[PDB]
């Protein structure tokens, strides 16, 4: 025979039986996954505006989406803040002054 019992560590970590309704609620219980499924935009680069143009542009559009809660192309935000974006890219101003 040489019976081989279930190890104790297997039982020490078992979960109560859960149907699909309980599985779904156990997945989505605590603080929302949006807290960790997101990007935080910051001006890490100090290089000139010639390179890393795209990451400045992404940070600028993220600033628009944070201050105005969504994209605002219908209001021509780019031309309204073109001078401001230009000062941000050439590093005359910081992100806080842009905001």
């Amino acid at each position: 025979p040489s019976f081989e019992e279930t190890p104790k560590f297997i039982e020490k970590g078992t979960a109560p039986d859960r149907a699909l309704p309980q599985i779904r609620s156990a997945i989505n219980q605590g603080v929302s996954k949006k807290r960790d499924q997101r990007k935080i935009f910051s001006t890490v680069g100090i290089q000139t505006s010639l390179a890393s143009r795209t990451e400045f542009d992404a940070l600028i559009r993220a600033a628009y989406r944070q201050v105005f809660e969504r994209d605002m192309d219908s209001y021509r935000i780019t031309e309204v803040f073109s001078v401001l974006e230009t000062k941000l890219r050439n590093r005359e101003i910081t992100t806080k002054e842009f905001i």
Binding site: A15, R18, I23, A26, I27, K33, K34, S74
Partner: protein
Amino acid sequence: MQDAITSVINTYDVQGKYFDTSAFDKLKAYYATGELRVRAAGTISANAATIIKEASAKLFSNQPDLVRPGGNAYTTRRYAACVRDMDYFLRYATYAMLAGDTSILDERVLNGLKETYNSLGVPISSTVQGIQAMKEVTGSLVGSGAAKEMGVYFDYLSSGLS
């Protein structure tokens, strides 16, 4: 939001179980369709403006009252907001298609959408019709195999709004 992989991982985590044969089966199923999904996503991304063009053309043709005065899509502002919403739906449907899961549709799109549309006076049934129109245009664009699987998420959005 969770994709199919994280869906299986999360169910087995809240059940405290190691992956069994069924889990690896669902994982193989997701990995087998990944090229189809990626190709469809790229096609939709390249032709997003087109899809919005035909879908909005169809929606406003079948319902001319929306863009005439007294309609919810009568102004340049409200017309642009309508096509912006249609772009939202297409982009997030493509996200759900890539993820192989409708979780992002509940979390990022449908949450508060009905009450916001009721608060704004947006017609929900007409919005569902526009979503269906995007369904036909996108299906004609990406081919039948990808068409059915994009239609899954389109009808999910339609049912969530309705």
